[PDB]
């Protein structure tokens, strides 16, 4: 994923260099984060940027001749804020006050029109700034469309779907086209169809009398793209993450790897402790930080004492690492305290028992007493709401006689703002009710693929190994360990596409399913051998290949990949990907690492507390 950092920097810094003299830079707060990922303020100051302003708080000044704006053009908010600052700057400025505006990869006519209507933008220098798929992590590419999840499913707003297919085109057009496109879900299909049409646009530009025709050859380095919609798995997002990174996100929240507590230290995979602890189970990490403290203290507080240069130099060259580890260790110890206060208080373990018991198919009413205690203890809003939703999603619809008991805890837990919470849950389809006309679990060949159908967990729990009691928290052999045995469907639906061996072992579930093992093991390509399961999930199925004479040549080269020539695989989550899913994808990516490089691609990274607080953040 880090290879795109140069591209993102290239375009951002190029446009800034085009501005002569000293300039003030105005950055959208909701874009500044993603920008901070690729460049530092010092990177921008090296290009002549002096002051740093924001649009939302109307922060302006007249200190520089050139004023430069960076913002998303998918909303009028920025066009208005920019025009507002321009009008104020021109009124107070005693200089030429040249203005420059940098927009999304394709600046919109709407944005430009709104700017022009201001009457003060007539001399403005407006240009495209094609930043997409920000390098949030070495294995993760994110468009950072943080509001994508909410808008994409509350209003069915396709904006992130359109941006994603374009952003994906923005990669494959340079690294070669995906020889195969597959995916599951309504929005997943849209992305797959958009990618096919965008390829036609690249040839059509010549026929349109515009840009030169692209060769559009298939990639020799990229094997495939897998696109999965958020609507496909509405159960996984409702479980609390048990990993260390999950502890941080579940209690505090991770954005831009920055996060609240000090903004002096960034926590990411480059950290020597985080790369080892981030995927650790909460029951284990409490012992890993002590393991780190013992090994760190031995080299940091001892061994080097009284040593002469000949031996001391071994610790001197490493000391900077020991100091960083000690600083990160204290931070990690503070996170450990946060979990300890929930495990010694029967809060974290209590919600886990509910998640494990529901996953196994236990009657959800039996877990109600455990949920009531969590509400009574004033645990965080998203931690109670997840349990007050998951129970219905697992069952596939429950009678109102029982739903009301859980619903009472939703209104009691959220207060008068619960009205927005319930409306968002229904619109986001994260709450099921038997009384609904949409309360229909997909049946075998039951004309599946409609927007009014839901994934049949109660069937797929037998078709796939979604229930795992074999998880090893310290040394796991399955993704299920992230949830201590949940074996999340959103990942199984990807694993069964990524490798035929995964398909063979994943579908080896109940005694009426394992008979298909020999068929599942033949799924060398596409969805073959997985049709029984694909047909029982929500939304349509997409499977198409790249056209052209050399398509077979590239396909053979890509299926001939080896450890000395690893091939890249794109896994795409539409509507945003949760941290539990990212950790699960890293686990499988490591197992397949010997042959292929699997990269996680998303419209956004969903915080565990972002989905259940939609009624809180939009209520502020």
């Amino acid at each position: 994923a880090e290879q795109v950092r140069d591209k993102a920097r290239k375009d951002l810094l190029h446009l800034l260099e085009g501005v002569r003299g000293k300039k003030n830079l105005v950055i959208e707060k909701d874009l500044a984060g993603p920008l901070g990922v690729i460049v530092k303020a010092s990177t921008l100051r090296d290009y002549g940027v002096d002051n740093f302003f924001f649009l939302e708080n109307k922060n302006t000044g007249t200190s520089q001749r050139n004023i430069v704006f960076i913002a998303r053009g998918e909303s009028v908010r920025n066009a208005h804020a920019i025009a507002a600052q321009i009008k104020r700057i021109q009124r107070e400025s005693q200089t030429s006050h040249d203005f420059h505006i940098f927009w999304v990869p394709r600046r919109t006519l709407f944005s430009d029109k709104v700017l022009e209507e201001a009457g003060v933008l007539g001399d403005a220098n407006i240009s495209e700034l094609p930043l997409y798929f920000f390098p949030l992590e070495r294995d993760v590419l994110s468009l950072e469309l943080n509001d994508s999840f909410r808008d994409l499913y509350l209003a069915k707003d396709p904006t992130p779907v359109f941006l994603l297919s374009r952003a994906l085109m923005g990669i494959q057009k340079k690294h070669g086209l995906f020889p195969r496109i597959i995916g599951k879900g309504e929005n997943a299909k849209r992305v797959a169809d958009l990618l096919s049409r965008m390829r036609q646009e690249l040839l059509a530009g010549e026929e349109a009398g515009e840009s030169d025709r692209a060769g559009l050859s298939p990639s020799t380095t990229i094997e495939s793209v897998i696109i999965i919609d958020r609507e496909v798995d509405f159960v996984t997002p409702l479980l609390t993450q048990l990993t260390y990174e999950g502890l941080i996100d579940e209690y505090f929240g991770i954005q831009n790897n920055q996060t609240d507590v000090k903004r002096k230290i960034q926590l990411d995979g480059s950290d020597s402790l985080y790369s080892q602890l981030r995927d650790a189970n909460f029951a284990i990490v409490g012992s890993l930080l002590n393991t780190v403290a013992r090994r760190l203290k031995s080299d940091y507080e001892s061994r080097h004492n009284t040593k002469t240069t000949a031996e001391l130099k071994e610790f001197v060259k490493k000391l900077p690492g020991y100091q960083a580890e000690q600083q990160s260790l204290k931070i990690h110890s503070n996170i450990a305290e946060e979990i300890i206060n929930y495990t010694r208080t029967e809060i974290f373990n209590k919600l886990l028992e509910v998640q494990q018991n529901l996953a196994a198919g236990a009657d959800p009413s039996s877990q109600f007493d455990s949920i009531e205690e969590l509400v009574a203890r004033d645990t965080p809003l998203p931690q109670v709401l997840r349990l007050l939703c998951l129970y219905s999603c697992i069952s596939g619809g429950i009678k109102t006689k029982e739903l009301d008991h859980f619903r009472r805890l939703v209104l009691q837990g959220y207060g008068h703002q619960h009205l927005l919470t319930l409306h968002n849950l229904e619109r986001l389809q994260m709450f099921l009710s038997k009384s609904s006309p949409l309360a229909s679990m997909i049946t075998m060949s039951g004309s599946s693929g409609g927007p009014d159908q839901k994934t049949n967990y109660t069937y797929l729990r037998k078709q796939l190994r979604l229930i795992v009691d074999e998880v090893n928290e310290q040394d796991p052999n399955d993704i299920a360990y992230v949830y201590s045995g949940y074996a999340p469907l959103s990942i199984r639906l990807v694993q069964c596409v990524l490798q035929k061996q995964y398909l063979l072992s994943i579908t080896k579930g109940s005694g009426t399913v394992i008979a298909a093992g020999p068929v599942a093991g033949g799924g060398a390509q596409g969805w073959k051998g997985f049709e029984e399961i694909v047909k029982h999930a929500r939304g349509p199925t997409f499977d198409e290949i790249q056209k052209g004479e050399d398509k077979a040549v590239k396909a053979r080269a890509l299926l001939s990949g080896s450890s000395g020539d690893k091939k890249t695989v794109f896994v795409v989550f539409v509507g945003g990907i949760t941290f539990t899913e990212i950790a699960a994808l890293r686990f499988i990516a490591k197992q397949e690492e010997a042959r292929r490089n699997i990269v996680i691609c998303t419209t956004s990274i969903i915080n565990g507390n972002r989905m259940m607080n939609a009624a809180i953040e939009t209520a502020t």
Binding site: E74, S75, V76, R77, H80, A81, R106, R107, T108, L109, F110, K113, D151, A155, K156, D157, P158, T159, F162, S165, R166, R190, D193, L194, R197, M198, Q200, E201, L203, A204, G205, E207, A208, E210, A376, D378, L381, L403, D404, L411, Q412, G413, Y414, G415, H416, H418, L419, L420, L422, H423, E426, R427, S433, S435, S436, P437, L438, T618, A619, T620
Partner: protein, 278 residues
């Protein structure tokens, strides 16, 4: 070429001096103006001249002069233009629009996949629905918004909402514009209510008013906006069993918090039921 056009059946004999005075391309147009394309190609081939203008002229002649149906003609035109891969479909489709053959123009514009050009051509032809489809299929949020703005400006609201509702992706993007009237949370309820009526989004109409209820000063404005939000929930009680009954609970949940602030001095506003009991 001189002998080719000197035969007594079809031709116009031409001297060297006359040949030189008439532009090289004029040795083609002299036949195109007669609706002669077979010879026009032969003449152009001998003279090593462009033949794209011949196929364009011929296709336009079929559009204006033919007694054939739009589908019969458009099939014949695309077969001839596809073998001469220049830019001809827009030119003929424009002629087809002028001649009233809008079915023919639509088919010709399907051979130019780039929505960047097809959308403004469909808008220039005042053809609705199709302009949205080209923008949506390409996934260009500029073109989709652009068509939406042109539909919003051209149509008297009711036709605007009913055309975008037929294309749910466009409908949601209409809402996206309506959610940001001035931006920064300033939603336009005038457009949102009509968008929601087309898609029967009763809970989203209430959610707009509820967001105002909570973004505006707590309690004092929340009570007025929540009561207004309730007026968008006056629908069927099926499906949305708990979502609709929640409006009564929201009023009682806020009412008890305000009551405690008045009598207990210490405010309970913004607290959950379990938090207030604590």
């Amino acid at each position: 070429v001189l002998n080719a056009v000197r035969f007594y059946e079809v031709g116009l004999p031409l001297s060297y001096e006359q040949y030189q005075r008439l532009s090289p391309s004029g040795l083609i147009s002299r036949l195109l103006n007669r609706h002669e394309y077979l010879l026009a190609i032969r003449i152009a081939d001998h003279l090593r001249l462009p033949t794209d203008k011949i196929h364009v002229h011929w296709a336009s002649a079929k559009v204006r002069l033919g007694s054939e149906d739009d589908d019969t003609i458009c099939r014949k035109i695309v077969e001839k233009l596809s073998g001469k891969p220049g830019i001809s479909f827009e030119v003929i489709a424009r002629t087809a629009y002028e001649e009233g053959r809008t079915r023919l123009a639509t088919e010709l514009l399907n051979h130019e996949p780039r929505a960047g050009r097809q959308v403004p051509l469909l808008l220039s032809m005042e053809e609705d629905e199709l302009a949205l489809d080209k923008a949506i299929e390409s996934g260009d949020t500029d073109l989709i918004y652009f068509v939406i703005h042109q539909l919003r400006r051209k149509l008297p609201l009711a036709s605007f909402f009913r055309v975008v509702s037929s294309r749910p992706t466009a409908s949601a993007m209409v809402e996206a514009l309506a959610r940001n009237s001035d931006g920064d949370g300033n939603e336009d309820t005038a457009l949102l209510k009509d968008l929601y009526y087309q898609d029967d989004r009763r809970l989203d109409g209430a959610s707009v008013f509820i967001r105002e209820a909570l973004q505006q000063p707590e309690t004092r404005t929340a009570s007025d906006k929540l009561d207004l939000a309730a007026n968008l929930l006056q629908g069927n009680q099926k499906e949305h069993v708990f979502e609709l009954g929640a409006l009564k609970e929201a009023k009682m949940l806020l009412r008890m918090q305000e009551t405690f602030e008045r009598d207990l001095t210490d405010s309970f506003v913004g607290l959950s039921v379990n938090q207030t009991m604590f």
